[PDB]
């Protein structure tokens, strides 16, 4: 590694070391920030002057207002300190973090030249610095574009402020690309402590439980039961309230248990919550649905299919039953062109081409064929029809059957975008559709949350993190934010 590469890796490693001690590996908590400051920048925080120093520092660095310091905020802080130190050394004529900052300063000064009383890089100096310290980063004159991109004041040079801003940007890009020891007994002890603390320490409960995998939460529940002789979920049900309770109790169930309880809740009592039933049944895969069927009958002493049959009717019932069987053809990864064309033509003949609809044909095709096959089928279907599959569904059917078909085609085409749209709908208006938001954040945090976030940011222009921040507050908000995993 080059000296500059080594310094960047050192800054990343410092952040990683301190961010992993509690909560998320992606941010620093206030306590983590105080520890980092004491060990890596001793004396900068003048604690002893005031014991509130870290609160002020956190407020100063917390650009997005979530009471944590992610890597973007941390790296802009490190760059500001390094630039100030460069100017201080200029005007005047060791921990790991301090070492990395000093290394960046030394690297700049080893390629820089005198200009006025400052040290700057011309284009050629910048060229050689890039080729020797960041090999592979650099068009015939890509160094000129790099110069113009960094030259903020437009004086045809790169001073240290512009350089350190560039270094911060590329270190941040490396960390985010990397984004894109566990012990159950210790977790259980700390959770019991947080539960028995007067008033309940919900912050610790969230910090731990929303930053473990489902399997690790099962381990923690077993360790808690063995330590306490009481069930973790009952203790937390007693200790918590409201939406935070909903979130935590959902996280404590296995994926299949959670989906099964949500389906039962969608059918238990008068009427039906068709939106929830449709979301779960159309979005879940073969393996997920088979596990749901087993666990559902375990938990409720009846078949999920029998509950669906009892709660629904007509073609909507037919579609839901067929989908809930969870025996769609698996991705064969061998393309059946003849069947793609025949399925497309059948879908057209059954719907837009004729008066009425051959709904059983639609159901057979869209529940039995594999997902890649059906993606190709929808593209081919367009060749026959002036309306794509979704608009065809809107023109052909209505009510719960139409809703089910629309959701199903969306999950076949782009399931992350489906969930991004559902989340946006759950938050966009007044109040929150907390049931939907919680169910999606809990059920997809470990599945495709990165892709959901990417589609959400692409379509709506701000992050899923941001919308959660605006719609929810308190420990509930912080739990949902940890389940999202990061801003953008």
């Amino acid at each position: 590694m080059t000296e500059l590469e080594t310094a960047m890796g050192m800054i990343i490693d410092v952040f990683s070391r301190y961010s992993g001690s509690e909560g998320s590996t992606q941010t620093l908590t206030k306590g983590e920030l105080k520890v980092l400051m004491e060990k890596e920048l001793p004396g900068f925080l003048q604690s002893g002057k005031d014991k509130d120093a870290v609160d002020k520092l956190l407020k100063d660095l917390d650009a997005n207002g979530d009471a944590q310091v992610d890597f973007s905020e941390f790296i802009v802080f490190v760059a500001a300190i390094t630039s100030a130190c460069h100017k201080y050394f200029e005007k005047a004529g060791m921990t790991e973090l301090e070492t990395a900052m000093g290394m960046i300063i030394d690297v700049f000064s080893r390629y820089s030249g005198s200009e006025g009383s400052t040290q700057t890089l011309t284009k050629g100096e910048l060229k050689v610095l890039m080729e020797k310290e960041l090999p592979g980063f650099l068009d015939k004159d890509a160094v000129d574009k790099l110069l113009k991109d960094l030259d903020a004041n437009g004086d045809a040079q790169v001073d240290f402020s512009e350089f350190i801003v560039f270094v911060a940007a590329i270190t941040s890009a490396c960390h985010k690309y990397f984004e894109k020891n566990f012990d159950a007994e210790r977790d259980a002890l700390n959770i019991e402590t947080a539960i028995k603390t007067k008033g309940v320490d919900e912050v610790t409960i969230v910090n731990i439980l929303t930053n473990r995998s489902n399997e690790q939460r099962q381990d923690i529940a077993f360790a808690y039961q063995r330590r306490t002789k009481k069930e973790l979920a009952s203790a937390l049900k007693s200790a918590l309230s409201g939406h935070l309770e909903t979130v935590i109790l959902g996280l404590l169930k296995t994926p299949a248990q959670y989906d099964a309880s949500e389906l039962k809740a969608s059918m238990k009592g008068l009427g039906t919550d068709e939106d929830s039933l449709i979301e779960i049944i159309c979005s879940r895969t073969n393996q997920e649905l088979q596990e749901i069927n087993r666990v559902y009958k375990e938990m409720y002493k009846t078949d999920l299919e029998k509950d669906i049959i009892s709660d629904t009717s007509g073609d909507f019932r037919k579609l839901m039953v067929a989908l809930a069987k969870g025996r769609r053809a698996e991705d064969g990864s061998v393309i059946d062109y003849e069947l793609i064309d025949q399925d497309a033509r059948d879908l057209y003949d059954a719907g837009v081409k004729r008066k009425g609809t051959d709904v059983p044909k639609w159901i057979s095709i869209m529940t039995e064929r594999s997902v890649p096959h059906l993606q190709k089928v929808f593209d081919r279907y367009k060749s026959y029809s002036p309306y794509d599959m979704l608009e065809s569904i809107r023109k052909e059917v209505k009510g719960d059957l139409e809703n089910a078909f629309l959701n199903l085609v969306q999950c076949i085409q782009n399931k992350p975008l489906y969930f991004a749209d559902r989340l946006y709908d759950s938050m966009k208006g007044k109040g929150t559709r907390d049931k939907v938001l919680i169910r999606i954040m809990v059920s997809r945090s470990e599945v495709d949350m990165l892709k959901i976030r990417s589609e959400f940011k692409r379509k709506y222009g701000k992050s899923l993190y941001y919308y959660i921040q605006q719609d929810t507050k308190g420990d509930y908000q912080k739990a949902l934010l940890y389940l999202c995993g990061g801003d953008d």
Partner: protein, 32 residues
């Protein structure tokens, strides 16, 4: 990092850094 540069494709946080207003006076106070 050599091969990672092709993998990435990243904005410049110049205003965020300026807003912190860290000056050599701060570093002087820190260095005692």
């Amino acid at each position: 990092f050599s091969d990672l540069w092709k993998l990435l494709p990243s904005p410049l946080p110049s205003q965020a850094m300026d807003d912190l207003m860290l000056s050599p006076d701060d570093i002087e106070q820190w260095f005692t």
